[PDB]
Scaffold this active site. Structure first.
Site, PDB file in Angstrom:
ATOM      1  N   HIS A  83      21.903  -8.421   8.851  1.00  0.00           N
ATOM      2  CA  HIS A  83      22.099  -8.909  10.214  1.00  0.00           C
ATOM      3  C   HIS A  83      21.010  -8.481  11.194  1.00  0.00           C
ATOM      4  O   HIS A  83      20.438  -7.403  11.069  1.00  0.00           O
ATOM      5  CB  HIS A  83      23.512  -8.499  10.717  1.00  0.00           C
ATOM      6  CG  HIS A  83      23.637  -7.078  11.185  1.00  0.00           C
ATOM      7  ND1 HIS A  83      23.238  -6.669  12.440  1.00  0.00           N
ATOM      8  CD2 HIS A  83      24.181  -5.986  10.592  1.00  0.00           C
ATOM      9  CE1 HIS A  83      23.494  -5.381  12.586  1.00  0.00           C
ATOM     10  NE2 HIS A  83      24.071  -4.943  11.482  1.00  0.00           N
ATOM     11  N   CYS A  84      20.640  -9.386  12.103  1.00  0.00           N
ATOM     12  CA  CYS A  84      19.888  -8.998  13.303  1.00  0.00           C
ATOM     13  C   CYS A  84      20.873  -9.232  14.441  1.00  0.00           C
ATOM     14  O   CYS A  84      22.075  -9.062  14.247  1.00  0.00           O
ATOM     15  CB  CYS A  84      18.550  -9.765  13.493  1.00  0.00           C
ATOM     16  SG  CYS A  84      18.731 -11.575  13.569  1.00  0.00           S
ATOM     17  N   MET A  85      20.413  -9.619  15.620  1.00  0.00           N
ATOM     18  CA  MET A  85      21.352  -9.763  16.714  1.00  0.00           C
ATOM     19  C   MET A  85      21.960 -11.170  16.706  1.00  0.00           C
ATOM     20  O   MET A  85      23.188 -11.323  16.677  1.00  0.00           O
ATOM     21  CB  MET A  85      20.709  -9.464  18.053  1.00  0.00           C
ATOM     22  CG  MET A  85      21.760  -9.129  19.106  1.00  0.00           C
ATOM     23  SD  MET A  85      21.197  -7.937  20.320  1.00  0.00           S
ATOM     24  CE  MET A  85      20.048  -8.954  21.229  1.00  0.00           C
TER      25      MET A  85
END
Length: 149
Positions: free
Chosen positions: A92-94
């Protein structure tokens, strides 16, 4: 399951960033997380994963930038090791599109040997907008050249 995650195979999924309220949720479904967000953009400490027994790879990629090929290879090797352990891995990133989608595309190329054009199409079918920038596409081209060698 945590329906924000989209699986690119049986073991590896990508998503937006889980909130603190979602941590037990994700920990129920995944045994490892690849955290691509800078620490200063986190709303909790990554110790939250450790107290739940979830393994963490923190390899941040700045917003709207691509990892280096070497960074991408390190992340890929670590995902492979968790998957070999029978673990499910959340990337995950944002936002859930650019940096996470790039690593997701890379995982398909790296683990399944898919060519870039098919791996890209797969991940964008899962999340339209995935792999957002020219540099992200270009490091995936460099990875392909690396792998075909």
């Amino acid at each position: 399951m945590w329906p924000s995650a989209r699986f690119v195979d049986d073991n590896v999924a990508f998503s937006r960033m889980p909130t603190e309220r979602e941590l037990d949720e994700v920990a129920k479904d995944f045994d490892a997380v690849v955290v691509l967000v800078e620490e200063y953009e986190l709303p909790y400490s990554l110790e939250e994963w450790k107290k739940r027994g979830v393994e963490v790879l923190h390899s941040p990629i700045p917003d709207f930038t691509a990892p280096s090929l070497e960074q991408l290879l390190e992340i890929l090797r670590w995902i492979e090791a968790r998957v070999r352990e029978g673990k499910k891995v959340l990337i995950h990133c944002m936002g859930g599109l650019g940096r996470s989608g790039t690593v997701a595309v890379a995982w398909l190329m790296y683990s399944k040997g898919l060519p870039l054009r098919e791996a890209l199409r797969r991940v964008r079918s899962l999340r339209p907008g995935a792999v957002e920038t020219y540099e992200q596409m270009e490091v995936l081209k460099e990875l392909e050249k690396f792998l075909r060698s």
